[PDB]
Amino acid sequence: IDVEKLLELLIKAAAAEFTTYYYYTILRNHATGLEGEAIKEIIEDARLEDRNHFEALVPRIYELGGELPRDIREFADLASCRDAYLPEEPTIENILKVLLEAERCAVGVYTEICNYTFGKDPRTYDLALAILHEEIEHEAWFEELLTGKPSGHFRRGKPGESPYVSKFLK
Amino acid sequence: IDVEKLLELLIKAAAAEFTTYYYYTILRNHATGLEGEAIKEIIEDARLEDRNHFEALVPRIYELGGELPRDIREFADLASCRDAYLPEEPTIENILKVLLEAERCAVGVYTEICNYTFGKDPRTYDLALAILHEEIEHEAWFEELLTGKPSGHFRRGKPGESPYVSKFLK
Amino acid sequence: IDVEKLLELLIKAAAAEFTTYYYYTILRNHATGLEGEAIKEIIEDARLEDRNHFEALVPRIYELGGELPRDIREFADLASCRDAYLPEEPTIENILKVLLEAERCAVGVYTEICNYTFGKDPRTYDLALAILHEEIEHEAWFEELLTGKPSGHFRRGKPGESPYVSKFLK
Amino acid sequence: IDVEKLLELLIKAAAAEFTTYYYYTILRNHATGLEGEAIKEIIEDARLEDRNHFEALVPRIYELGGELPRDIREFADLASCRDAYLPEEPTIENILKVLLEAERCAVGVYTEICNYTFGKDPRTYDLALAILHEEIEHEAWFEELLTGKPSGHFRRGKPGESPYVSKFLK
Amino acid sequence: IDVEKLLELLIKAAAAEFTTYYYYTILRNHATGLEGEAIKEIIEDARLEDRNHFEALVPRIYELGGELPRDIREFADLASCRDAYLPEEPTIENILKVLLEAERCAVGVYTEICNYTFGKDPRTYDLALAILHEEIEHEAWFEELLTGKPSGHFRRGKPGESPYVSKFLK
Amino acid sequence: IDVEKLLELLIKAAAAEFTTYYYYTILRNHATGLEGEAIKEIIEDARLEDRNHFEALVPRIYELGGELPRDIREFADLASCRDAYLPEEPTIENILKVLLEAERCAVGVYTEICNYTFGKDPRTYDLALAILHEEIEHEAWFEELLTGKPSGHFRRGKPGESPYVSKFLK
Amino acid sequence: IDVEKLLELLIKAAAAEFTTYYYYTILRNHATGLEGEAIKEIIEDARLEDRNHFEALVPRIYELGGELPRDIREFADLASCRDAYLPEEPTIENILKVLLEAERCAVGVYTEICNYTFGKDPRTYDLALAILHEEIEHEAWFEELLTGKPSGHFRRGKPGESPYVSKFLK
Amino acid sequence: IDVEKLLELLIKAAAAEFTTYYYYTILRNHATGLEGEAIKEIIEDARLEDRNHFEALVPRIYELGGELPRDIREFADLASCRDAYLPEEPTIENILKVLLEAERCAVGVYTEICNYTFGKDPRTYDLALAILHEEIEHEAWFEELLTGKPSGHFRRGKPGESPYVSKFLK
Amino acid sequence: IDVEKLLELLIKAAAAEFTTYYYYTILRNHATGLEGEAIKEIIEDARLEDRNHFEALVPRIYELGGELPRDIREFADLASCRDAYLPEEPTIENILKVLLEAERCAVGVYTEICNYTFGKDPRTYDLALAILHEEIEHEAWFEELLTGKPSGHFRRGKPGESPYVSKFLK
Amino acid sequence: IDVEKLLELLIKAAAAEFTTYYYYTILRNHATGLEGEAIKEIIEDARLEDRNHFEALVPRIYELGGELPRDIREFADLASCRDAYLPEEPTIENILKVLLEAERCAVGVYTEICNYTFGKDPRTYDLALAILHEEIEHEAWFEELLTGKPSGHFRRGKPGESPYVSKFLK
Amino acid sequence: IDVEKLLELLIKAAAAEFTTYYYYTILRNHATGLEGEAIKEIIEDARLEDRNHFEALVPRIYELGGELPRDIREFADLASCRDAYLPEEPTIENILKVLLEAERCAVGVYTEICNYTFGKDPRTYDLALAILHEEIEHEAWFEELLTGKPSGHFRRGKPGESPYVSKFLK
Amino acid sequence: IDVEKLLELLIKAAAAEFTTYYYYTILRNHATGLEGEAIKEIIEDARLEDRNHFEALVPRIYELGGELPRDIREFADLASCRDAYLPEEPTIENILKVLLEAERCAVGVYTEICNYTFGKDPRTYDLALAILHEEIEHEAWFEELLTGKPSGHFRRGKPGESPYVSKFLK
Ligand SMILES: [Fe+3]
Ligand SMILES: [Fe+3]
Ligand SMILES: [Fe+3]
Ligand SMILES: [Fe+3]
Ligand SMILES: [Fe+3]
Ligand SMILES: [Fe+3]
Ligand SMILES: [Fe+3]
Ligand SMILES: [Fe+3]
C-alpha cells in the first residue's frame, strides 16, 4: 500500500466532510415552510454525522504520518466533492437534488478508499467502511425523499448518533 | 365462561397481531416522499405496539390452557382481520385506507373479547382492555391523518412504548 | 356494598400477604442444591411482590375506615390462607407443593374480593384486580416448575418489580 | 350509551380540572407560616395532578367527537365543581376546608362518570377510574390534614407524578 | 420603578400565558391531515413552554407583593394578547396565522417589560428576558412554517423543555 | 464465641426488626393532622430501614447454622423489644414516646451484639455495627422531635435508603 | 455481484429469522419443569435476537432494490431453514436438538452470504457478519447445554441485547 | 470601573458566604422539635447554596487579579454581613429572625455589586445577578415562614441545587 | 440599533468560531510529549466550546434576517480574528502563545458586541454575554498555563460542556 | 505490628486472588450441560470479585512500602492457596469441591490477616475485613450448591459487584 | 470513655477539616503553569473530601452532646493542625510540602481518635476510621507527587467522591 | 485454515494479554512524581483494555475447541511478547520504552492473526481486528508521550472502555 496515496485520499475525504458541515448548515436553514419541515431534521442528522466523520478521520491521518493543511482555505480546496451550494432557486426539490448529489459523491469516496485498503490496511479499511455505512444511509434518506424509492430507514435516535462510526469517536 | 370459545378468540387476535407486524413493515417501507415522511413514524409506532400485543397475548393463551398452532401458516390463517396488503396503487392515501381498515377491525376484535369476559374473567378482560386502549389510539392516529377528524393524540415517546399494555410485558 | 364485610376480607388478605413474606423467607433459604438453584430466584420474586401486596392493601383498608389489629399475633391469626410451613421432608418437590398451594389460595382470595366489589367499589376492585394479576402469575410460575404445564412467563426484571400493583405503591 | 350526555359530563369534568389548576395556585401561595409549610407540598402535588387530569381528558373528548368550547370563559363556566376561591379569612384551617370540599366534589364527578360508563364504554370507564384513583387519594390527603382521619398515604415521589393516569399522558 | 405598574404588566403577561395554554390546546387538535402533522409537535412545544411561562411568572408576582385575581374569569380578561381563537375556516394556513399573531404579541409584551425594568429591577428583567428568548423562538418557528423565512431553529429535545426559563422553574 | 448464644441474640434481634415493620405501619397511619405531617415521613424512613435490618440479619443467621422459627407467632414472641403498640391516647406526643422507647431498645440490642462479637466474629460484628449506625440515627431523629435535643441529621434521600447496611442487602 | 441472487439469499434469510421468532415462542413455552428452567432464558435471548436480525435485514433488502413478498404465507415458505417445530415428544433434550439444528442452519446461511459478498458488497458483508456473530453464539449456547462442549459464553445482559447487530438497528 | 473597589466588594461578599456556611450549620442543628422540622430542610437548602456562592465567587476574584486573604481569620473579619449567631434564646421564631436578617443583608450586598457593574463588567454583573436570584429566593423562604407573606416558592429539588448559579460552578 | 452593522459583527464572530474549530484541531494534535499532555485536554475543551459558539450564533444571524456567505472560503475570510496557525517552531510554549492570542481576540469580539447591543437588543446581548463568559474562561485557562497567573478554574466536566451557552444550543 | 510480616501476608493473599482469576476462568468454562448452567453465573460472580480483591490489595501493599514481585511466575508461586486446578474428572460435583476448597482457604487467609491487624493497623484490618465478607459469601454459595446447607444468599446484582470492597476500588 | 475528652478531639478535628477547605482553595489557585496542572485536580479532590469530613463530623459531635463554638474565629483557633498557609515562595514543590505536612497531621489526628475509641465507641470509631481511610489516601497522593514513592492510587471518579465516608453523608 | 495453528496463536495472544495485566500494574505504580502523573492514567487505560482483550479471547479459544493450559505458569510461559519488566533504572523515560516495546509487539501479534484468518475465519478475523484497533491506539499513546510523534488520540472516557472490543465482552 502506498501510504502517501492513501493519505491524500483520506485528507480529501476529511476536507469533504468538513465543508459539508458548513454547507449543510445553510441548506438546513433554507428547508422552510410545511414541506421544508419534512426534511429539516434529516438534513440535521446528516450534517452532524458528517461532522463526526471529520472527527473520526483526523486521528487516522495523524496515525499514518499525515497532517492537515496549514491553512483552512487550502484544506477546503482539497475536498473530494463539489461544494453543496445552495441552489439559485432554493426550492425543497432543488435542495434535495444538491443533498443527493453530495451524498452519492461521498459514497463513491469511501468506496474508493475501501477498495484501495481491502486486505492491506485493516484499521483504515474498517474506518472507511464505518463511514461508508453512514453515507449509504444518508444517500438512502435523500433518495427516498426525492424520488420515492422505498427504503427501510428511520430518523436516528438522537441527531448525530453515528451508530457505525461512534467506536472511532472520543 | 366457555374457555374454549375464549381461547379461540385470543388465538385469532394473536394471529392478527403477528401478521400485522409483517404487513405494516411493508406498508412503512412504501410511505415514501415528502408526504410519506408525515406517516412513516406513525406506522412504526403502531407496528411495534402490535408486536407487543402479540407478546402480551401469548402468556394468557397458555395460562388458560391453550397453545399456539404447530405451523406458522396455520397460525396466519387464523387472523381475525384481513391481511393488510399493500394496495395495488400504493399512494399515501391508499396506504392510509388500508391502515385505518386494519385498525378498525382490531378495535372490533378486542371490543368483542371485552364484552365476552366482562365480569367473568377479570385478568383476560383487563388484558383485552389494555390492548383496546392502544388500538383505539392507533385508529385515532390514522383517522386523523386520512379524514382530518380532530384528535388530541401525539406520537409516542419512543416507538413501541405501549403505555397501556407494558404492565403485561416482560 | 357492606363495608364491614369488605374490610374483613381486605384485612384477612393483608394478613395472608404479611405472613407469606415471613414463610417464603424460610422456603427460599431451603431451596438448596443444584435443583434448588432453579427456584430460589422465583421464590424471591414472589416473596417481594407479596410484601408489595401488603403495602398496597394497607392504605385502602384505612381509606375505607378500617384498621390493622393492635397486636401482630392477632393479625397473623386472621390470614385467609394456611401458613406456608416448611414441609417435614423439605425436598424441592415438597417445597413447590407448599408454594403452589399458597398461591392457589391467594388467587381464590382476590377472586372473591373482585367478585364482591365488581360494579360497586371501583377503586377496591381495581386494587384487588392488580394483585390478582400478580397472584395468577405466581401460580403459573410454580405450576410450571412442579407439574410441567406450559406457560409463557419469565422471571421479573428486578425482584419485587410488581408491574401491576406498582401504581398503588409509594 | 348517550354520547352527547357523556361528552357533556367529560367537558364539565375537564373544566373543573382546568380551573382547579388556577385556583390551587392561589391557595398554595397562601399556605404560609410554619403550619402552612405542612401543606404547601401537598397542595402542589394535587394541583399538578389535576393539570394532568385535564391533559388526559382532552384526547378522550376529541376521540368521542366532542370539542372544547371556543372561549375560555365559557369553558370555565362549565366546571362541574364550584370555584375553589381563597377564603375571606385565609387561615390554614379555612384553606383546608376549601381543598377538601373541592376534592369531594371531584370524587363525585368521576364516580358519576364511572357509573354511567360501566360495562358500556370501557376506554372512558378506565380513564374515569384512573382519575378517580387520584381524586380519592387527594381527598384522603386533605381529610387527614384537616380532621385527623388516619390514612396510609404519603407524598408523591415527584410532584405531579400521577401514578394512575400517566398511562393516558403523552 | 413603579411597582404597581410593573405588577400590572406581569399579571397581564401571566394571563396571556395561561389562556394561551387553553387556546393552543384547541389549535393543536385541529392541526389535522398530512400537512397538519407538520405543525402539531411545534404547537405542542409552544403550548407547554407557555404553560411554563405562567409557572415562572407567578412567584415573581408574589415576590413583588402582587396577587392573582380572585376569579379565573377576571384573570382571563386581563390577558395582554387577544384570545387565539380557532379560525372560522380552520385550515392549516389560517391556524398558522393565528399562532404567528399570538407569538408576535407575546414578543411585544416581554419587550415592553424588559424595557421598563432594564437597569432597575434585575431579577424581573432577567425573568422577562428568559421568557423573551422563548417567545422569539416561538415566533421564528411559526414565521418559518407560514412565510418560508429561513431560520436556524429545530424542535426542542422534549416538549416543554424551556431551556431559557427552566432556571426559574421548580 | 458461643455460637448458640450468638444465634439466639441474632434471632431475637431479627424478630424485633420484623415486628417493628408491622407496628410502625400502624404508628405511621396515626400520625395525622398538621403536627402529624411533621413526623410521618420520619416514621416511614425508620420503618423501611428496620425492614432492611431484618433482611440483612437472616443470611447471617443461616450462615452461622441457625434458622428462623417454624411458626411466625413463635418468631414474634422472640422479639428482644416490647411491641411498639399504638398508645391508648394516640396523640403525636404519645406516639413519639413509643417510637423513642423502641429505638432506644434497638440501640441496646445491637450494642450487646457488638460487645459480644468484638474481636471474635468480625463479619457478625460488622453487620451488628452497620445496623447500630442506623438505630443510633433513628433514635436521634425521634429524640430531636420529642425533646428538642439538637442533632445534625436530615431525612434520608429516599425512604429505606439504609446507607450503612446496604452493602449487606441484595 | 449478481444483485438478484444476493436479494434472494437475503429474503430467504429474513424469512428464516421471522419464522424463528414464531417457532421459538412455542419452544420457550414448553421448556417447563426444573430442567426446563435452565434453558427458558436462553431460548428467549435467541428468540429476541433473531427478531432483531429480521429487523436488520429488511432495510438492506430495500436498499438493494428488493422487497418483501406481498403475502406473509409466501414469505414463510421462503425460509432458508426448516421450521423449528415442537418435537412430537417435547422433552427438554428433544427441544434442544431442534434448537441446535435450527442454529446450525442459520450459521450456514450467513456463512454463505458472507462468502458471496466478501470483497464485493462491503455493507452487506458487514451486516451478514454481524448476524453471523450472533448465530455462532446461539449455536454455542445450545451445543453447550445439549452435548456439554465447553464454551466461554454467558447469558446476555438484557434479552435481545444483540451486541453485534445493534449498530444496524433503529 | 475601579477594579480594586470591585475586588474589595467581591472578597467581602465571598467572606459573608463562607461564614454563612458555618453559622447556618449551627442554626440548622438547633431547629428542633415539631416546629423546627418545618424549617430544617429550608435552612439546609440555603446553607448549601451559600456554599455554592463562595465557590462561584472565588474564580472571578482571581480572574480580576485579586486573591483571598492569607489567613482564614482575616477572611472572616471581612464579611459584609454580621455573623448569624445563634440567638441567646434559640426558639424557632428567634432563629428565623436571624436567618431573615442575614438574607436581607445578602440581597443588599449583591444589589450593590450589580449596581456598580451594570453596563461596565458584564461577566461580574451576570455572576452577581445569578447569586442575587438565589438570595432573593432565600429571603422569600424565610419571610414566608416568619411573617406569613405569601410567596410562590417551593423547596429545591435537591439541596444545594443552585439553579441560577450552577452555570458558574465546576 | 443598526441591524446591518450588528449582522456584520455576528457573521464575523461566527467565522472566527468556525475557523477556530479547524485550527485548534491542528494545535491539539501538536501538543505532544509529557508537557503537551498537560494542555491537550484543555485545547480540546476550548475547541468543542468554540464549535458550540458557531452553532449558537447561526440561529441568531438568521433570526435577524442575515445569512451565512454562499461560499465557505468567503466565510473564512470574514473571521474577526487572525488564523491560529501552528507556529513555525511548534513548541508547547509557542502553541500556548497562539492560543492565548486567539482567545484574547475572541474576548474583544464579544465585548464589542455586548457594548453595541447593551440595552437595545436583549436577546443578542444575552447570547454575546453567554459566549463572552466562555471566552473569558478560555483566556484564563491559557494565561494560567503560559504565564502562571493564578486562577480558580478547572477542566470542564465533559469536553464541550458549554455551561453558559447550552441554553442556546439544540 | 511487624510490617514485613504483614507485607508478606498481603502479597501472598494478592497472589491467591490473581491466580484464582485465571483458574476460575477454566472452571467456569467446564460448568457445562443442564446442571452446569446452575453454577456458571455463580463461578463468574466469584471470579470477578476475586479480581476486584487483587485490585484492592495492590494499593495497600504499596502504601505499606511493599511491592509486587518482578516476575509474574514468582508472584504466582507465592499464592497462599493451592491452585484451583480443573479436576481430572471434571464433573459438576468435582468442580464444586475444588471451588469450595479454594474459598475455604481464602476465608482462612483473610481471617489470619484480620487477627494479625486487629487494633493495630485499622486501614489494613478494614480492607481484610471487606474482602473477608466477600469470601464468606463465596464459601456460602458453593457450600449451598454442593452440600445443601441452607443459606440466605442470592446472586449479585451485576457480576463483580463487590458490595463490600467497592469503597476500596477505583 | 471520657465523652468530654472525645468531644474535644472531634471538634478540633472538625476545625482542621473546615480550615483545610479554605486553605486548599488558595493552594489550588496557585498550582499554575505546566507542572501546576499535574496537581490541581489532586488538590481539588482532597479539598472537597475534607469538606465532606467536616460534614460527617458535625452530626456525631451533636449526637454525643457537643456543639460547635459560637464564633467561627474560635472554631478556627481549635484546629488540630497548623494552618496550611501558602508558602512565601509558592513553587509547586513548596506547595506540595505544605500539602503533605497537612495530610500527615490529619492522619495523626484520626489515628489518635481511632486509638481512643477502639472497642469503646463503635460508631465514633467507624467514623474516625472512614475519614482515616481518606486521609491515608490523601497523604499517599501527595507523597507520590513530591518524593516519588510508588503508590497504587488514582484520581477519584468525581472530585469529592469520598468513597469511604459517603455512608455518613446526607 | 489450520485450526491447531490458529489455536496456538490465540492462546499465545491471550497469555500476552494476561501477563500484561500483571506487569502494567507494576509499571503504573512506578509512574511517580510530577512527570509520572502525566502517564499514570494512560497506563491504567491500556492495562484495563488488555485485561478486556484476555476476556474477549477466551470464548473464541473455547469456541474453536481449544483450552487454556492447566497451570497458570505454563500459560504465562506461552506469552507471544516478552515480559514488560520494570526497568533496572525505572525513570519515566525508561518505563515508556518498555510500554512502547510491549505495545509494538502486541500490534504485531494481532496483525499476524488477521493476516492468517483474512477471508477464512470471519469471526476470528473480526475479533483480532477489534483488538488490533485498541493495540494501535495504545501504541500511538505511548509513541506520542515518548517520541513526540503527533497523534489525534485522547484519553478514554472511562478507563477500560474498550470501544472496539466491547461487542465481544459480557
Ligand atoms: Fe411530511
Ligand atoms: Fe438448577
Ligand atoms: Fe409545618
Ligand atoms: Fe407539620
Ligand atoms: Fe413541622
Ligand atoms: Fe503533563
Ligand atoms: Fe441448571
Ligand atoms: Fe502537568
Author numbering:
A (entry chain K), B (entry chain L), C (entry chain D), D (entry chain C), E (entry chain J), F (entry chain A), ...: 14 to 183
Relevant lines from the article:
Following incubation with 50 iron atoms per cage and stoichiometric amounts of H2O2 for 10 min, native mass spectrometry on intact protein cages indicated an average mass of 257 032 Da. Relative to the unloaded particles (256 118 Da), this was a mean increase of 913.6 Da, corresponding to approximately 10 Fe­(O)­OH units per cage. The overall structure of the iron nucleated particle is largely similar to the unmineralized structure, with a Cα RMSD of 0.37 Å. However, within the pore, we were able to model 11 iron atoms and 19 oxygen atoms in a 3-fold symmetric structure. Moving along the 3-fold axis from the interior of the particle outward, the six oxygen layers are stacked in an ABCACA manner, with the four innermost layers (ABCA···) resembling a cubic close-packed structure (ccp), while the 4 outer layers (..CACA) are instead hexagonal close-packed (hcp). Residues in the 3-fold channel that interact with the mineralized iron include Leu47, Glu50 and Glu54. However, in contrast to these prepositioned main chain carbonyl groups, the carboxylate side chains of Glu50 and Glu54 are rotated away from the nucleation site in the unmineralized structure, implying subsequent movement of these side chains into the nucleated conformation as the reaction proceeds. Overall, we see that DPSL utilizes a preformed, 3-fold symmetric crucible that is rich in precisely positioned carboxylate side chains and unsaturated main chain carbonyls.
